[PDB]
Write a protein that binds this ligand. Structure first.
Ligand code: JLW
Ligand code: NA
Length: 744
């Protein structure tokens, strides 16, 4: 079963897959020449790869003559075009590999004066490598009698040669396997990095369809993200066990990541007050901790978590209607108050937890002020002598006589070991909560430490208050609390709303009643010029920013409003950052019109301290609410945010990392081009079948014909690859098709 139309079939095949190839690869040269000034490192590599494609294409004529007649060109040129092919395949493998290390370091150019040195020095080194390893091809190819009529044909030499294995296998492991392996390393981590910058990682996974999750936890809310001096990422959240609402059995928890957010450890629990086992409605039968602010003091390295606390009830909706005094100053000391069932007077908790009567006599009762159980679940337990009776934070079905005021409190815990272990909670309420304040709680997220100015080192925590005139209907007002002594002592700054003009009249946080003049949870930033900016959740539809020239203590009277950034009435987070010598602010919040379509806004800080918004880019489609930003270093940033997919309970807290290229460039310019991928897969899928069939050619007569038609088509695909390569540059390519058509 033979034929000789296969003798004329190849003259036309080598003709067209040589014109397409020499036309396409010629366009690649000419376009590179008059464009030389703006040439990359890969642009010089893709050139030499077209040179290799041309040199191999310039032999296909001589195969057309030989198939149409015979080889009239000698043993010299026969030995030479097989070696010239190995030059193409080996250089292409090493040119492709030089793209790899280029893109590897470029995603893991700054001085053009040595981007040419090492670039073209490896063009010369590859050709020397390609030419040296291909010179052994001169001895395994020559002219053949063949006993096939009067026909002289050029071909590799047949089976009887085996001293070749010590030579040829070496060629393929250096000219191919080393490229293939090293290319496989580069483009594997390159893919890992692009994965890291484009996919979210679930940090606190909520349950699904209303059920609890692997750990019996229905819901997570309220993220905080902190980057420590040691490079650690701390992610904090509310662990909302029973439901998603702002009350119930909530624990303050964190997860540490020691590799910049790739993997995260197990949950650490700062605080989890024990529930009331005798409460009638469990969904509201536990003392509550809710909303934390993280910040690390950069001198001492102590990490602070500051958060709200309410006694047993519906959180802020469990406060008493008429005020209950919570603290009482006696002989210069401030003690917390206890109310005893049946009576009116104020018991006090003095030294060691000892409960004193309204007239100052010690009782046999005692409060666990220094808890010792895991998560400090035992804080507030009430003992008579050494018998446990109850807990001062319980307000219903009590098993002891004493409860604390049903008011609003502010607690703080610290870590001196990178967040692995946390102190017992310390009550900072009496240092910051004035008498008129109905509520005082944090704006969750990440506070700051002033970097510059006459107040540097001061720690700022955002908070907001209500008064007893209008409470949550018209007095929510932002401010900061601060500490100038490394967290020991706290002070309340003034409110943005104190002495502010609204409708031609002054207002004050303590007396106001005015829904549209409120401002609630906020995020704080210090500029390099020393001013403090406060970005405040409010109800004008757009971003409100207040300014303080004295380190947070007082605020200017004018609230700047930026319609460029919409505020759908939800928390946001903002951070200061530098880039290439210029100052910027990144702000993240829901882009709307509901709590959805998470966005990252970019602003440049002008000389006056005002913001020029440059860019607004979606960071997360779908449900998007509270979030927390941090700078990670080396032009990268992370964001921990509330989100729900596919019937997740509100909310799951996820982590995304991004860089300045995502942050500044337009929506289309991603990067994951990667025409390089297409060239590599074809340079393998086509050439590898050939050079493998010619290696198994070595190791009745018509079983080798199966090995011979293997030799034909796999040599045919290795020829068509030198045409497919310019088509790769134009279609999926970005620069080429643009640049070529624009020089016509
Ligand atoms: C000067 C000039 C005009 C036209 C051309 C063609 N270069 C490309 N054509 S293409 O397919 O559009 N892509 C090309 N290069 C290319 C690929 C991939 C990357 C990552 C870069 C890179 O290293 N950059 C830092 C961004 C790059 O530059 C040549 C060389 C094939 C002729 O070069
Ligand atoms: Na090419």
């Amino acid at each position: 079963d033979v034929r000789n139309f296969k003798a004329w079939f190849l003259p036309i095949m080598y003709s067209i897959i040589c014109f397409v190839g020499l036309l396409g690869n010629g366009l690649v040269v000419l376009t590179y020449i008059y464009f030389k000034r703006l040439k990359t490192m890969t642009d010089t590599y893709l050139l030499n790869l077209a040179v290799a494609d041309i040199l191999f294409l310039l032999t296909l004529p001589f195969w057309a003559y030989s198939a149409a007649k015979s080889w009239v060109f000698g043993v010299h040129f026969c030995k030479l075009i097989f070696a010239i092919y190995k030059m193409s395949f080996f250089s292409g493998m090493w040119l492709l590999l030089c793209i790899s290390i280029d893109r590897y370091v470029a995603i893991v150019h700054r001085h053009r004066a040595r981007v040419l040195l090492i670039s073209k020095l490896s063009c010369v080194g590859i050709w020397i490598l390609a030419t040296v390893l291909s010179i052994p091809e001169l001895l395994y190819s020559d002219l053949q009698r063949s006993s096939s009529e009067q026909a002289m044909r050029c071909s590799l030499i047949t089976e009887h040669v085996e001293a070749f294995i010590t030579i040829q296998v070496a060629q393929m492991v250096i000219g191919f396997l080393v490229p293939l392996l090293a290319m496989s390393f580069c483009y594997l981590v390159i893919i890992s990095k692009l994965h890291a910058l484009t996919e979210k990682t679930d940090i606190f996974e909520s349950g699904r369809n209303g059920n609890p999750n692997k750990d019996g936890i229905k819901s997570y809310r309220i993220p905080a993200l902190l980057k420590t001096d040691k490079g650690t990422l701390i992610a904090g959240a509310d662990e909302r066990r029973l439901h998603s609402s702002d009350w119930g059995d909530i624990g303050m928890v964190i997860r540490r990541s020691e590799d910049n957010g790739k993997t995260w450890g197990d949950r650490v629990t700062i605080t989890n007050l024990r529930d009331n086992p005798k409460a009638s409605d469990p969904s509201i039968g536990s003392p509550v901790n809710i909303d934390m602010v993280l910040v690390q003091d950069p001198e001492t390295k102590r990490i602070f978590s500051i958060y709200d606390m309410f006694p047993e009830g519906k959180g802020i909706f469990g406060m008493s209607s008429q005020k209950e005094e919570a603290y009482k100053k006696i002989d210069g000391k401030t003690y917390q108050i206890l109310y005893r069932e049946g009576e009116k007077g104020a018991y006090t908790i003095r030294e060691n937890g000892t409960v004193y009567t309204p007239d100052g006599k010690a009782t046999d009762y005692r409060v666990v002020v220094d808890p010792v159980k895991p998560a400090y679940s035992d804080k507030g337990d009430l003992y008579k002598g050494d018998q446990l009776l109850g807990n001062i934070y319980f307000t219903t079905n009590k098993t002891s006589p004493f409860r604390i005021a049903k008011d609003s409190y502010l607690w703080m815990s610290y870590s001196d070991d990178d967040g692995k272990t946390w102190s017992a909670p310390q009550d900072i309420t009496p240092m910051v909560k004035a008498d008129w304040m109905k509520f005082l709680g944090v704006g969750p997220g990440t506070g700051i430490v002033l970097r510059n100015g006459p107040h540097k080192g001061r720690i700022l925590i955002p908070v907001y208050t209500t008064n007893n005139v209008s409470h949550l209907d018209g007095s929510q007002s932002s401010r900061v609390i601060y500490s100038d002594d490394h967290g020991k002592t706290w002070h309340a700054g003034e409110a943005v709303n104190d002495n502010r003009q609204v409708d031609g009249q002054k207002i004050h946080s303590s007396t106001m009643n005015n829904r549209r003049a409120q401002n609630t949870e906020s995020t704080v930033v210090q500029l390099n010029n020393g001013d403090v900016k406060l970005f405040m959740r409010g109800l004008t539809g757009d971003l409100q920013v207040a300014t303080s020239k004295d380190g947070g203590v007082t605020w200017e009277k004018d609230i700047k409003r930026y319609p460029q950034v919409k505020d759908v009435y939800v928390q946001m987070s903002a951070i200061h950052t530098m880039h290439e010598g210029k100052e910027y602010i990144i702000l993240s919040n829901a882009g709307g019109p509901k709590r959805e379509n998470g966005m990252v806004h970019l602003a440049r800080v002008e000389e006056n301290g005002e913001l020029t918004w440059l860019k607004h880019n979606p960071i997360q489609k779908g449900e998007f609410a509270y979030n927390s930003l941090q700078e990670l270093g080396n032009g990268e940033y992370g964001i921990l945010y509330e989100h729900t997919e596919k019937g997740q309970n509100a909310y799951t807290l996820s982590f995304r990392k991004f860089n300045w290229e995502f942050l500044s460039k337009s929506k289309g310019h991603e990067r994951n081009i990667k025409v390089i991928i297409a060239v590599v897969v074809v340079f393998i899928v086509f050439q590898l079948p050939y050079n493998g069939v010619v290696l198994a050619q070595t190791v009745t007569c018509e079983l080798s014909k199966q090995l011979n038609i293997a030799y034909d088509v796999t040599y045919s695909l290795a020829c068509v690859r030198c045409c497919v390569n310019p088509f790769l540059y134009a279609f999926i390519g970005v620069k080429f098709r643009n640049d070529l058509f624009k020089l016509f």
